[model samples]
Target chain A: MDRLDRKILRILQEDSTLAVADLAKKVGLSTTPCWRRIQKMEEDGVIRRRVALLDPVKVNTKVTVFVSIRTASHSIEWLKRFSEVVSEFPEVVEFYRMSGDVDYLLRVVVPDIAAYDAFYKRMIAKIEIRDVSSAFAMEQIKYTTELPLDYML
Target chain B: MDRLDRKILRILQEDSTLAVADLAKKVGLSTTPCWRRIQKMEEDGVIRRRVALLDPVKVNTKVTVFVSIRTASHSIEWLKRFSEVVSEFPEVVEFYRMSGDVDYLLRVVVPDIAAYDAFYKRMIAKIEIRDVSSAFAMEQIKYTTELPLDYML
Candidate 1:
């Protein structure tokens, strides 16, 4: 990707719905060529997907919980089963395997405390977990899907 | 928002780049009505923004770090200053105020450990923080911008 591709990406990361003509003009390129660049990036997996980010409050899933899970079982079979169970839960928006005290970290969204309690119980029942700690978010200061283009090669 | 709106959102959340004609056909609605629904949602802030999701690896920011911070200061002024400082860092993709022991939580991305070390030192030099715990993600098991629609009223 060249400087033009980077310019196009920086704009698109903020607003992907911009018309090709408008996007092309802003990036100092013609419509057809700019469109081709976007297509190529998408094909190359540089641009993963274009998505609509919804307001958590409007969706009734305003309660955000960061769950730290510790499991005694480190076997691949157990991990596979655990992954399968967590994948089924729509509440778990982000999950990660960490290299610290916490084995697994999950970012969960639910309607409220009671819903989260229900979810926590349902999850533990399906798997063997040593410990689970949930931290509720009081406020979201900043969030953005827009990655920094300076790091792009 | 009705069932139709929810259906439209469910589709759009996954792929916002879909054409109105294709989106309408999938949702079993006419072009104009479907377009109107999308427009209304955008106006109402239900659909916050459509953004292009880029690959972290491709962008040279594959390292993910979860930074948990605690501060002795709780004043609004301190928070305001801290927010401004954190906002300036493009490495910090997600930042939040929490209810547990940790006062603030940040999800950061960097090129490598050295980059994160430099970022950490720069951040701490700006503000007074009581405690900071950083957990590096070994693997990103699951990450998606899609929110669950079942809770939407």
Candidate 2:
């Protein structure tokens, strides 16, 4: 990707609904070239998808919890089963297999601590983790999906 | 908001670029009414904004680190300064003032360990933090921006 491609991505990530005409004008490319560039990126899988990001509070998902999990099971079979179990829960929006002392980490959102407690219970009953610790977020100072394009190749 | 509104939101959150005609047909609403509902949600601050999501691997931000920060300074001024500093760095995508033992939590994306180390240096140089522990994410099993539709009010 070139500088122009990066610029287009930066703008699109900020506001996907921006018209093609406006994007072309802002990025200093002609209509056809700019359109081609965007199409190429979409085809290349740089731009994975477009989605409307909603406010968590308005959607009744006001509580954000980060769960650090430990697992004694290290087999590929167990990992597959655990991944399937984790994906079944809607509350767990983000899940990761990390390279630290913690085997897995999850970012869960729920209405409140009570709702989170219910989710926690449901999760533990399915897959047995050696340890599951959660930390609640008091205030989200900043959250953004926009990634820096300076490092893109 | 009614069931139709929720359905529209659910679809929009998954794919914001879905044409109005397709969206209206999917939700079993006429063009004008469906368009009005979307506009209303935008005005009501329910659908915050539309953005194109990029693949982290494609952008070279393959390393995801969750930084748990603890500080003895609890003054409003310290908090404000820390928040501003965190927001200024593009690498630090998500920043939150959290509950429990951890004072703040930051989700940072970078190219590699060296990139993360550089980011860490810049952050420490600008802001003084007591305890800064980072956990690297190896595999993102599941990640999504779409919130649960059942919780819509």
Top of the candidates by lDDT: 1
Evaluate model 2: give its lDDT. Answer: 0.90
What are the candidates' individual DockQ scores? 0.86, 0.86
Docking class of 1: high
Return the DockQ of model 1. Answer: 0.86
A1-153 in candidate 1: lDDT tens per residue?
Answer: 788999999998899988999999999999999999999999999999999999988988898999999988587987987987897788899999898999999999999999899989888888888899999999888988888777788
Reference contact recovery of candidate 1: 0.88
User: What does the TM-score come to for chain B in model 1?
Assistant: 0.97
**By summed lDDT, which 10 consecutive residues of candidate 1 chain A come out lowest?**
A144-153
On residues B1-153, what C-alpha lDDT tens digit does candidate 2 reach at each position? 789988998898889988998999999999999999999989989899999999999999988999989988578987798799889999988898899988899999999999999889999999888899999998889988887767667
Cα displacement (angstroms), candidate 2, residue B86, comes to: 0.7
- Give the interface RMSD of each candidate: 0.9, 0.9
* Candidate 1 clashes between residue pairs 3 or more apart in a chain or in different chains: none
Q: What is the lDDT of residue B132 in candidate 2?
A: 93
- Tens digits of per-residue lDDT for model 2, A17-82: 988989999999888899999999999999999999998888889889999899895789889999
